[PDB]
Amino acid sequence: STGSATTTPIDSLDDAYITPVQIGTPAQTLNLDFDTGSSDLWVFSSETTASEVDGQTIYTPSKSTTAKLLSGATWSISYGDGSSSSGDVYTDTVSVGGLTVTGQAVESAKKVSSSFTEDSTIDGLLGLAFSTLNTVSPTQQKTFFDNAKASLDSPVFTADLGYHAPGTYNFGFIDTTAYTGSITYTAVSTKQGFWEWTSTGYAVGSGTFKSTSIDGIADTGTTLLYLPATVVSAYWAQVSGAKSSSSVGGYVFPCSATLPSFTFGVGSARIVIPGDYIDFGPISTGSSSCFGGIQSSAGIGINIFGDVALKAAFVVFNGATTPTLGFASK
Ligand code: NA
């Protein structure tokens, strides 16, 4: 089997992407944030504290003939941005882009933090990291990909995120029409539960490539590219008037600037992030200070190849017995 679903930016900045997901019988369609940096499929629901719901579509298990309470199971998760959610668990039928899993754990939120409530466009998360990170207790649950894997034509999924445009998540096949040149595959460590890999270096604009190992994670649920402070300083030094602002919480730059590209290495291959991808717009409405899309990972304890990086590539998440990542230009 295969599946193929379109993923759509939630706003004009590509702050996140949402993908429609069918849950239950008859189908309830929720727009979920597919997150290769976490491993829980959780949804706003009929159980979510009413004051914490503001415009999201909810899953109502009582209206699904295939829903069943997973008795005694609870979940609670905290993300890198400080947000959190928790609740209880149902199993139900879940379909993505025509690919169906029966008996998928659907984590129903009883509580969500303010940033979830405030984002009316995201109805929950669908985690695509390794199932070792799933938070369900006392019986850890599998991700949608892990449950689908054995049925897929190939044990893979791909992320093809758009810049200011829709893109695609495919399950079970490589769309050889969706990228240019060849796919370069690179090793993955699953030891922290992430799609963790090592980039071979970077370049800023038309500058020379710096060969250096940068360990980090491929994380579709993170908006920005978080790299070591040395790398980030070298990038922003090429932008007149850019500076790190402790008050704003990262590098800012004049909205009048033209940003340089940023290149990262995948083995001997190179992915180029156009400068425009690094512009996250005014820090507050009407400001002439703009927020940068490349930020320091210092204090986060890991480098994160978030959407700024991934949307410059066609990315293969290869879930074979020994997982690997693949990157192609597009
Ligand atoms: Na922000």
Q: Cα separation of 242 and 255, whole Å? A: 10
Cis peptide before 138 (omega within 30 of 0): yes
Q: Give distance in angstroms: CA of 236 to centre of ligand 1.
A: 17
Residue with tokens 């790398």, as numbered in its chain? 231
Report CA(33)–ligand 1 centroid distance (Å): 17
CA of 181 to the centre of ligand 1 (A): 34
Tokens 């849950």, residue located: 23
104 CA from centroid of ligand 1 (Å): 33
Which one is catalytic: 35, 40, 88, 160? 35
Do the beta carbons of residue 284 and residue 245 sit within 8 Å? no
d(CA 63, CA 65): 6
Active site residue 88: no
CA of 253 to the centre of ligand 1 (A): 14
Distance from the CA of 154 to the center of ligand 1, in angstroms?
A: 37
Q: Which residue(s) pair with 201 in the sheet? A: 211
CA dist 85 and 33 (Å) reads 14
Cα separation, 159 vs 15, whole angstroms: 16
- Ligand 1: distance of its center to the CA of 66 in Å? 39
Residues linked to residue 74 through DSSP beta bridges, in sequence order: 88, 137
Q: Is 293:277 a contact under the CB 8 Å cutoff?
A: yes
175 is catalytic: no
Check: CB of residue 56 under 8 Å from CB of residue 28. Answer: no
- Count the alpha carbons within 13 Å of 208 in the hemisphere toward its beta carbon: 3
Instruction: Give the integer Cα–Cα distance in Å for 271 and 313.
Output: 7
Question: Of 38, 199, 261, 296, which one is the catalytic site residue?
Answer: 199
Q: What separation in Å is there between the alpha carbon of 51 and the centre of ligand 1?
A: 24
Distance 15 CA to ligand 1 centre (A): 9
Q: Please give the biggest Cα pair distance in the chain.
A: 60
Centroid of ligand 1 to alpha carbon of 219 (angstroms): 17
Complete domains list, the chain, with CATH: 5-174 (2.40.70.10), 175-330 (2.40.70.10)
d(CA 258, CA 240): 9
Q: How far apart are CA 78 and CA 168, in angstroms?
A: 27
Q: Contact, 116 vs 189, CB < 8 A?
A: no
* 3-class DSSP string for the chain: CCEEEEEEECCCCCCCEEEEEEECCCCEEEEEEEECCCCCEEECECCCCHHHCCCCCCECHHHCCCCEEEEEEEEEEECCCCCEEEEEEEEEEEEECCEEEEEEEEEEEEEECHHHHHCCCCCEEEECCCHHHCCCECCCCCCHHHHHHHHCCCCEEEEECCCCCCEEEEECCCCCCCCCCCCEEEECECCCCCCEEEEEEEEECCCCCEEEEEEEEECCCCCCEEECHHHHHHHHCCCCCCEEECCCCEEEEECCCCCCCEEEEECCEEEEECHHHHEEEECCCCCCEEEECEEECCCCCCEEECHHHHCCCEEEEECCCCCEEEEECC
Query: How many CB atoms are closer than 10 A to CB 304?
Result: 24
Question: Rounded CA gap, 20 and 153, in Å?
Answer: 22
Q: Measured between alpha carbons, how far is 182 from 158 in angstroms, rounded to an integer?
A: 15
* Residue for token pair 């445009």: 165
CA of 310 to the centre of ligand 1 (A): 18
Distance 281 CA to ligand 1 centre (A): 10
Q: How far away, in angstroms, is 203 Cα from ligand 1 center?
A: 25
How far the first Cα of the chain sits from its last, in Å, is 25
